Amino acid sequence: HKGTLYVVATPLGNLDDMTFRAVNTLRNAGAIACEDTRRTSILLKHFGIEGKRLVSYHSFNEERAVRQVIELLEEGSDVALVTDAGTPAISDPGYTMASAAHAAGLPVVPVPG
Amino acid sequence: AHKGTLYVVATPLGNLDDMTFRAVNTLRNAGAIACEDTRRTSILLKHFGIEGKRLVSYHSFNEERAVRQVIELLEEGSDVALVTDAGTPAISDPGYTMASAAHAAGLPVVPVP
Q1: Residue B8 is part of which domain span?
Q2: Is the CB of B50 inside 8 Å of chain A's CB atoms?
Q3: Buried-state track A86-112, b at ≥16 Cβ within 10 A, e below 16
Q4: What is the total count of domains within chain A?
Q5: A8 at interface of B, judged by CB pairs closer than 8 A
Q6: Is B89 on the interface with A (CB under 8 A)?
Q7: Counting Cβ atoms within 10 Å, is residue B14 exposed (0-12), middle (13-18) or buried (19+)?
Q8: What's B8's domain CATH number?
Q9: Do A87 and B9 touch (CB under 8 A)?
Q10: A113 vs B contacts (CB less than 8 Å)
């Protein structure tokens, strides 16, 4: 049984405009992949979600972040990929990570927000 | 030799008139509009009275052709607007391949809020 890569947008302004579905993907993740650890930590703290491993997906270390996320998915854990607040949110590194999961045949599920 | 910009424009399913002027004007004056859902995009354009626009329609099997068309237009100094759905993350939209290709080509990719 494989984990799912959930792709989750963060709202601008009030974090209570997230959905329960979206926050559930964070609670249920083996790790949270993100491009802004500070904003991600603030988001987790807002919802009382403690102890989550954060995986940075910056360009330089992208290959390493991809390996880390693939390993978790293949081990059966979901991973949440959190994009910086904004809509639309541009992230080439994020896309690269989702692409890698899809190429490996792993489920990639966007979460409505 | 001035590079065109790929503008990524998020569009809602309803209440289209709540889109910003900036976003509608971007679509109105774009050199071409790239979209994965041509039917939905035509409905949007008709709504705002945007007539005669060149559309680049993205399909998996013909991914290359849509990407090539967009990159060629950007290299020729024309802006292109990629429409995506407002409610899901842009990096999940299959059409994001066109934004990642523009980035790979050193072309500007700009979100329109």
Answers
A1: 1-113
A2: no
A3: bbbbbbbbbbbbbbbbeeeebebebbe
A4: 1
A5: yes
A6: yes
A7: exposed
A8: 3.40.1010.10
A9: no
A10: 87-89
